[PDB]
Amino acid sequence: RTCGSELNMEQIRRTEPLKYQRITDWENQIKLHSRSVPSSTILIPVVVHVVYNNSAQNISDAQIISQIQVLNEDFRRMNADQANTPSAFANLAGNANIEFKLARRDPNGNTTNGITRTSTSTETFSMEMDNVKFSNLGGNNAWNTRRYLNIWVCNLGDDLLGYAQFPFEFQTKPNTDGVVIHYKHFGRDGSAESPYDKGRTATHAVGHWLDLRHIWGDDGGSCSGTDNIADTPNQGGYNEGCPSFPKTDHCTNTSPGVMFMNYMDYTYDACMNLFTKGQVERMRSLFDTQTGIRREMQIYANELTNP
Ligand SMILES: [Ca+2]
Ligand SMILES: [Ca+2]
Ligand SMILES: [Zn+2]
């Protein structure tokens, strides 16, 4: 598994002090136990931009709808494989109470099914250029990122499964906010290629878009980086595949060990089955009705997701 949304804090501090200051300011300013975090289901209008250079990349509506279903299961703890969560970690599992719905009104007020399809001469898209997010670079412009979650689906290449933009970048880069997913790994079963065939590449990416970091701290394997979530055990490097429970490492060397089945690890889709309650608090805090960076998304979410 490969994702382009690392936050290697040691590297950022050494090379980009303004970015480092923005992240530390971000972490100092989060108020998880605020009275103005909504208690109700948070509704997210989604628009999926299919950007395709061949027929394989022009994935079906059924395939896209299955991804929306997977997001609703994972973000509402309605995933059947929650039965796989070790009992030692089950008391920490969270229900984000976030719902996703394809948009039914586009930004100019036209009716839509929430899926855009754009043909392109670009053979492979680059995370560095973010070219998939711009019509003039062969991709497709984002839809008002204060009101829609944009999910681009394209050919990212054999190595990258997806990438997201973090919320601390929203103020400086609002037009590229959203998530990009490799077309081979979008939706559940169907055209999705094993072992990333259960729609978890988007769950993981959407977690980044909702302020979560890789559980091991993007620190090359050390015990020094953090994901800023206390209820995710300190972890060395990423886990891949599907380890056996319990897996201990040099950072958490006692049972129940590391939470390799967390969506924010790098394990196979079928190996993942939970967010924690700490991760859920972080995600929902973005919708704080007083200071939540994504609070405007709830104002017209109902109108934008009704035909
Ligand atoms: Ca942690
Ligand atoms: Ca680590
Ligand atoms: Zn990631």
Author numbering: 21 to 327
Provide the authors' own sentences about this structure as they appear in the paper.
As part of its virulence factor armamentarium, at the site of colonization it secretes mirolysin, a metallopeptidase of the unicellular pappalysin family, as a zymogen that is proteolytically auto-activated extracellularly at the Ser54–Arg55 bond.
A variant, in which the general base/acid Glu225 was replaced with alanine (E225A), lacked activity. This variant was used to obtain the intact zymogen for structural studies. Previously, this strategy has proven successful for other MP zymogens. We obtained two different crystal forms for native and selenomethionine-derivatized promirolysin E225A, which contained one and two protomers per asymmetric unit and diffracted to resolutions of 1.4 and 1.6 Å, respectively. Tyrosine-switch Tyr286 pinches the extended segment I together with the upper-rim-strand segment Leu181–Tyr183 of the CD. In the capital interaction for latency, downstream Cys23 Sγ binds the catalytic zinc at 2.11–2.22 Å in the different structures, which is closer than typical Zn–S distances (2.31 Å), and contributes together with the three histidine ligands to a tetrahedral zinc coordination sphere [Figs. 2(c) and 2(d)]. Activation does not lead to substantial re­arrangement, i.e. the CD and the active site are already preformed in the zymogen and just shielded by the PS. Thus, the results herein indicate that latency for promirolysin and uni­cellular pappalysins probably operates based on a cysteine switch featuring a cysteine imbedded here in a conserved cysteine–glycine motif.
